Design a protein around this ligand. Structure first.
Ligand SMILES: NC(=O)c1ccc[n+]([C@@H]2O[C@H](COP(=O)([O-])OP(=O)(O)OC[C@H]3O[C@@H](n4cnc5c(N)ncnc54)[C@H](OP(=O)(O)O)[C@@H]3O)[C@@H](O)[C@H]2O)c1
Ligand SMILES: NC(=O)c1ccc[n+]([C@@H]2O[C@H](COP(=O)([O-])OP(=O)(O)OC[C@H]3O[C@@H](n4cnc5c(N)ncnc54)[C@H](OP(=O)(O)O)[C@@H]3O)[C@@H](O)[C@H]2O)c1
Lengths: 261, 281
């Protein structure tokens, strides 16, 4: 038996999957619309069986407030994306009354092979139907740090996609352009493997920051001419400028790592 | 047996020049500074003393410099000796720089084509080397044979600046990727090491790279139907708050945030991240 809170795109995908493996799923929402046992209140859903999955951790505190009374005995798995510190404040608040997972998966991928979920009380932890489990510490907010990090790299990628598509829209359609992007991103995703190595040791040895700078300026000039915003690339430019100024004129794009603090 | 004449001996024009030698060509070479950027005729190259001597060295001319300004500057040389030649400018630049050059050089009897080298120097000659070419397709067809030694040719229009548009676009998406890598690494370094972290990033980016295929489709038709911009916004705010707490800069993500804020405000609260395409324009 499990009892879910939050029936958005992700909490439903999760709830649906627990059903397909024949579980006793209890479910709750602010605004109900289910397909399961429906918890009329948060108290009735707390006493049902606990996989929370909401908009923020504020919503976690807000919703579970009323149910101060029956927390004693339960094992709260918060899948809600958030900060490490939010997660630690919640873990201490809830352990005072008797974990965390970053779902590295879109809803459609839940139950799929490529689904993955990243911390907290390892007694309670010791889910697998949903995705490939990956525990990594008794630190209640370690999963959240790894969530946000991975998302940071995602959001880099989408920022490039959007800029790249936008910049070419006039001349060709986006799909016919994926014929060139998708391989190229593949190449460039490889080059980041041979950059984490540099970052881990401290090489940064030369495709030089001086020429890339005059390159990035050609994208900005070209973006304005195509009526596209180059605001996706500005931080990259600001960081390469810190680098050549600080002496890395002839060093690799790895060198910027020390200028992002 | 087949003769080429290069201009510009930086990291890229040397890689190119070196490769033409390894396929036993009659490679002529030129630079601003020869005594600087090596003119090792040792591997067989012929040093053009002036731009004129390098223009007359061959009828295939592969330029590759810092900017197009350097292209115009160097070839100025009252370019009367240009009639008959096939100028391949691999110099990264704007579509409009490329069109201004193509008209300038076609006025002097030459036949211009332009190329975005989608390849670092070490990749030149390799399987994954790729070069986009646009410009006079008459000139490109004749010299497609020779150029093919360097990378996989990919022609796409008689528009002298189409290769440059595709160059800068692809680079824009590269720079997005590195911006995410650096931010993502940075944010995690002080809890776990960058290499052990590529074990999670590299697959995940693979997933997310697939999702961009089914997003170009949306962008091409006009769906944007829901993974919603309202929740991602409170997500992106958690990365900014988390970055400050780890003493890391969240400056890589700010434009994304500014764009999602334009989107939910303009009504796309429940739409997919595809919807943002119309808010970069
Ligand atoms: N979708 C993805 O691709 C994806 C992937 C990985 C992780 N995630 C994570 O999943 C979390 C939820 O996923 P989602 O995509 O399902 O977002 P979602 O559909 O918006 O989930 C939000 C849920 O929380 C409830 N809620 C919203 N505001 C509330 C409030 N003020 N008080 C109480 N309850 C509230 C909603 O129900 P009511 O509106 O009825 O209250 C809704 O069911 C996200 O924050 C994100 O961390 C999403
Ligand atoms: N390396 C890569 O990863 C890569 C990848 C794709 C495309 N590219 C492009 O290939 C081209 C060259 O790249 P690179 O890495 O060789 O650049 P680099 O490291 O700066 O090479 C500099 C080259 O530009 C010349 N130059 C500078 N100012 C000039 C002027 N006023 N007149 C004539 N020549 C001038 C230099 O001459 P000196 O010898 O006197 O400096 C030298 O030939 C650029 O357009 C670059 O954007 C490079």
């Amino acid at each position: 038996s499990v009892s879910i809170f939050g029936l958005g795109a992700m909490g439903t995908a999760l709830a649906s999957r627990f059903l397909e493996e024949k579980y006793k799923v209890a479910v709750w929402n602010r605004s109900p619309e289910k397909a399961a046992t429906l918890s009329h209140t948060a108290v009735d859903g707390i006493n049902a069986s606990i996989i929370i999955c909401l908009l923020d951790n504020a919503a976690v505190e807000a919703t579970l407030a009323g149910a101060l009374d029956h927390l004693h005995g339960k094992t709260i798995i918060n899948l809600t994306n958030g900060t490490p510190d939010q997660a630690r404040k919640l873990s201490d608040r809830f352990v005072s009354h008797g974990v965390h997972g970053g779902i590295m998966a879109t809803p459609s991928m839940i139950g799929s092979p490529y689904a993955l979920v990243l911390s907290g009380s390892p007694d309670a932890f010791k889910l697998s139907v949903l995705a490939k489990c990956v525990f990594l510490g008794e630190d209640a907010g370690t999963a959240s740090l790894h969530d946000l990090a991975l998302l940071s790299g995602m959001y880099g990628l989408f920022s490039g996609f959007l800029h790249a598509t936008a910049l070419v829209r006039s001349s060709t359609p986006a799909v016919k352009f994926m014929d060139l992007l998708v391989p190229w991103l593949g190449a460039m995703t490889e080059y980041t493997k041979g950059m984490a190595k540099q970052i881990d040791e401290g090489k940064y040895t030369s495709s030089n920051l001086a020429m890339q700078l005059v390159g990035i300026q050609n994208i900005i000039d070209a973006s304005e001419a195509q009526q596209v915003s180059a605001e996706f690339i500005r931080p990259m430019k600001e960081f390469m400028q810190k680098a050549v100024a600080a002496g890395h004129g002839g060093d690799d794009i790895s060198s910027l790592i020390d200028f992002v603090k």
